[PDB]
Design a protein around this ligand. Sequence first.
Ligand code: SF4
Ligand code: SF4
Ligand code: FES
Ligand code: FES
Ligand code: FE2
Ligand code: FE2
Ligand code: FE
Ligand code: FE
Ligand code: FE
Ligand code: FE
Ligand code: FE
Ligand code: FE
Ligand code: FE
Ligand code: FE
Ligand code: FE
Ligand code: FE
Ligand code: H2S
Ligand code: H2S
Ligand code: H2S
Ligand code: H2S
Lengths: 633, 633
Amino acid sequence: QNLKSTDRAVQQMLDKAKREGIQTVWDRYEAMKPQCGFGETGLCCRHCLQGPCRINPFGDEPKVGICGATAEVIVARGLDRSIAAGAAGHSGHAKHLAHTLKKAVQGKAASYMIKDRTKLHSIAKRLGIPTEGQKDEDIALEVAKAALADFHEKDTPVLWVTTVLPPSRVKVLSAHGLIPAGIDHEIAEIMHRTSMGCDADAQNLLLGGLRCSLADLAGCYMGTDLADILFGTPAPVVTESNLGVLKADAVNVAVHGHNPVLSDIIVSVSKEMENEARAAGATGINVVGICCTGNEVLMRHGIPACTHSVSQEMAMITGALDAMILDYQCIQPSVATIAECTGTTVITTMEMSKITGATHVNFAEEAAVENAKQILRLAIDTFKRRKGKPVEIPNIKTKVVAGFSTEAIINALSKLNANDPLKPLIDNVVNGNIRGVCLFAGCNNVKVPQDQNFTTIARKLLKQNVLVVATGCGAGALMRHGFMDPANVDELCGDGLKAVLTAIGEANGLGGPLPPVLHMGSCVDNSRAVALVAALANRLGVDLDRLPVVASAAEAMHEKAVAIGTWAVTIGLPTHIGVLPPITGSLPVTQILTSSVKDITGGYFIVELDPETAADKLLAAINERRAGLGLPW
Amino acid sequence: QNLKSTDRAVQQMLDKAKREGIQTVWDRYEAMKPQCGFGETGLCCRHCLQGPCRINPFGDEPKVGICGATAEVIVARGLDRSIAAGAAGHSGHAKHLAHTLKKAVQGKAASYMIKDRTKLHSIAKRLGIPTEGQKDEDIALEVAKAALADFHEKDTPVLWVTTVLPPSRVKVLSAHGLIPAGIDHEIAEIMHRTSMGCDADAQNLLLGGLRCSLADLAGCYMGTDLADILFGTPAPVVTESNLGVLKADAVNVAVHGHNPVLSDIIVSVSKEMENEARAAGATGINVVGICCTGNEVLMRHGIPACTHSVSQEMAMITGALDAMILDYQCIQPSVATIAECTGTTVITTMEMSKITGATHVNFAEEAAVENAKQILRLAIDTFKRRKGKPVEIPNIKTKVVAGFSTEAIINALSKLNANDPLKPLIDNVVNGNIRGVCLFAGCNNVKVPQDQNFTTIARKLLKQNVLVVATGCGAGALMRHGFMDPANVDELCGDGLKAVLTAIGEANGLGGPLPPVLHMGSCVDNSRAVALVAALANRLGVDLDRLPVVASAAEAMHEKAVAIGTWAVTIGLPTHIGVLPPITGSLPVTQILTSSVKDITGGYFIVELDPETAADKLLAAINERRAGLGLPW
Ligand code: SF4
Ligand code: SF4
Ligand code: FES
Ligand code: FES
Ligand SMILES: [Fe+2]
Ligand SMILES: [Fe+2]
Ligand SMILES: [Fe+3]
Ligand SMILES: [Fe+3]
Ligand SMILES: [Fe+3]
Ligand SMILES: [Fe+3]
Ligand SMILES: [Fe+3]
Ligand SMILES: [Fe+3]
Ligand SMILES: [Fe+3]
Ligand SMILES: [Fe+3]
Ligand SMILES: [Fe+3]
Ligand SMILES: [Fe+3]
Ligand SMILES: [S]
Ligand SMILES: [S]
Ligand SMILES: [S]
Ligand SMILES: [S]
């Protein structure tokens, strides 16, 4: 089982699933091998009913699509559609939060409110919305209106791009025509240009993809901004992760998906129903997180994280998961059938994301509290049905310090330099105590033993004094393996990094260091890393493609991760991807994305499936940036 | 060669291509066989980097996707993405016309203007825009603003749906949640819900697809409305079709693609440059049409149609095509390489639709006349380069009467009943002289001998007194085979239909009948058929699912054709498709789309690859509607 997952709690549940005859994601993968090499390499097109068209990577015919589409065109069109799909998910999440904020301040959804007034005002100022002499509800209405306006063409480009990157970066992107005109506008233009008989030049197609990736970045940044207004900006918090956070004697409720609009309410309502849970024979309601919705409530409320991504079915296999409350994205639909075997009540809540066989509850912000109570009462009923049934919860969990929003990181740094908070970080980059910064992002992927790339690369970088930040299921992997526990700083961290983590932590009262890796939140919260990196660029007076900052989607899976990796490149970062994207069937496309894009945006992909080698390549990229700034390395 | 195309001019060019060693679409198809059966049946998914996933139609594993996605989910998600891609193309075309109209009336593009003031005012009235006491330029600015607003969420749904279908039809659709909220909004929501780990219920997915198909209908209707304002509403016109419309002694310029924003200008400017062409040794500039842009200028100006769809390369093979001027959609990118062998200058004009190896001219409405002259001078230079080179233009052409906009059809009917123009048509439906109405739409497809399904089905329906209307490359096929020549009425038409076509034609001064088939224009102009059918529904006081009206995408290819067929079903029509869409891998999906959707919208797909059988099934559908109205059949 260690060939499937490096997480020992997951291995234990894989053994239980095996002896119980419950098919898992790893079994479904095995049943799919050998997978189609045309699709793997990107050399398949189904964009019209003359297809499917495939192209042999090497050899004889077929060499070209039926309509004349070359391998370069087919590869670029497929990649573009994946970027647009990722943009559609992150920006759909953001759009749903914009409507929630609007309803809240119009008096239509009293369960929601402006919780972070400071963030509201700072966002308004960044957008150019006047605040002097205005009521908060009116400022927030204007912010929500501006958020919705960025989805379509108007007299300004997408402000959640142009107002969040330094002017010099916007200028570079504008010169290449890469600034998006509207989020949904770009998604639709991708779908058009990639349809049959339209765009058929690889460079033109890929420039379109870069622009659509910035629409994804805008959706990410808008989602973080709106969730922080509504639910609070994260600050440091201590909690736990892995399956051992489930409790046999409690009602265990997983919140799973991405948009916390309802699960933030689940968290507060669950505390009100504790006596109702006790009357049912439980100790209380134990809300736990899966995937990004779990990250959201972990960052804001310290809700413990049960599991992530590829191993999500294993929470059910314990027998103790009474409910799994779903919104959208990254939910294996297998959960609906597995629930028949495990007793879990799987509940969907969003109209556009249903699963055959799950119970649907039509969540509405206007009825959020009542919807939550209905859902939690189903979970309570399920707990009662398992009275006397043995469960197998692996007694495996790690300590997690998280909550490192960009505001929290700046505030922590300010304890070392109150009026120039970024300077202590830059000082330590310059003197070599911090070699550079690496953001781990993205998913797990069944093709890679779970977490093996994240942990292998992270260990090498930390020993070489890299400041490591993480989001989404990259944060999930690292938290489950102890990388967010300050007690592991001595084992994991180079001496220089250890010294910095210790100085900051002690200056913040912790009596110990910051953790080895800083959790910056959910996948939309990759935008927080952008805010941090853009703030460093501004403080130094250089563009992002001169900073010693890299990204790694070390185990990527979702179309969203493709979009994120693409915008990381577009804003100027060397960006590693540790699974093969469907590009290798076209050398010209691969060369653009890994080499000639450097001349456009200064960023570039690093495709490397071997994690030791990937770590070496990421260090080389960091060190090349250091040398370009005249620094030792 | 008759196994490839039933068009004799195409067969002649296929022989020339063969002996010259020029690879064609049919050769590329042969080189692709056998095609992948997983893709053919819809049982392939590449929506995440754990894929590709495939499912065996029958037999053993794989039976399910790696994430747990069933065959029903995979099939429905793929189909939804095709609908969204089609919507993105038609609505991108409409959006581009909306911006053109806005620029025209703001004084920013003097080559464009309000040409159809009556249509402008009628559209404004239908949208609720006041006209009394307003300048035309202000009414048109409001119409353009309303068009752009339908792309995003606002306080009203998509008006180019809700204002163009009868209230009873809107009510049915609203009750099922099918009215789109915004065109690009729905496209993006499709992309989100179909991404990994989101919507996973076939019925829910397909309802989303139906709603997105109505966003496509809105884009189609908006495109027709705006093109009619800008360029004139079609009226009956006489011209010719097929390769014989090329002239060796002229500069032959094909306009190819879909959006006539520039090619309508090409048409007028070409007439100004006739002396410049004569100074180069030509008789003049002979503008000819390919595909839908050709349909647009045929309908409005009688520009002869050279060829369509699958056979587009054959125009080049003549050796006499001096330029091919491209916008977007349905252009085989092979044209760029074939041009090296044939001498044709292939020119792209739209930023999001380039082809490696073609010359790009950056068309801007503000510079439309100058851009046109630059393009036409390249064509003139190319004509000069072929002085003394033999060409082979098949001496094959048909007479084409076209221009049957819905306004033109109503006006023609009004000569038989001035104040109740639809009544003569309804009278003849009731007495059986007109059995019903069939719209032929969509593309050719290399899998089907070119035009064989269109002509086989049309012949059977016409003998059975069906009024046949046609658009896009369905109109193209029928025009190239003589179905738009009134001289063929006696051979093709049943006695009842002949009597009606003759009465209308003679009442309109023609001294002869209307043609056997009425050309209603380009693919967006399928919206004109909707206008006609909705007007008949309103006049009869019934919904569209009670009318004896059917549609046939007899040789469909493009994602756009999937979207059109889906909205035809959604508005209530029995809708034949004569190529296999990628649905047969899921019986539950197939049953929804061909049977249980009847209970939702009253329409339904009829999948039938054999054209004789398809004609029988379409007649049965028409006759079932007749019986439901109490009529003999
Ligand atoms: S768009 Fe071209 S390559 Fe793709 S399926 Fe259609 S014919 Fe084949
Ligand atoms: S979304 Fe599911 S079915 Fe599709 S490729 Fe990914 S794992 Fe396979
Ligand atoms: S041929 Fe396998 S992905 Fe299309
Ligand atoms: S396996 Fe052939 S289309 Fe994917
Ligand atoms: Fe996520
Ligand atoms: Fe077309
Ligand atoms: Fe996840
Ligand atoms: Fe995910
Ligand atoms: Fe992910
Ligand atoms: Fe994730
Ligand atoms: Fe993610
Ligand atoms: Fe066409
Ligand atoms: Fe077409
Ligand atoms: Fe077509
Ligand atoms: Fe066509
Ligand atoms: Fe078409
Ligand atoms: S995700
Ligand atoms: S992701
Ligand atoms: S088309
Ligand atoms: S089409």
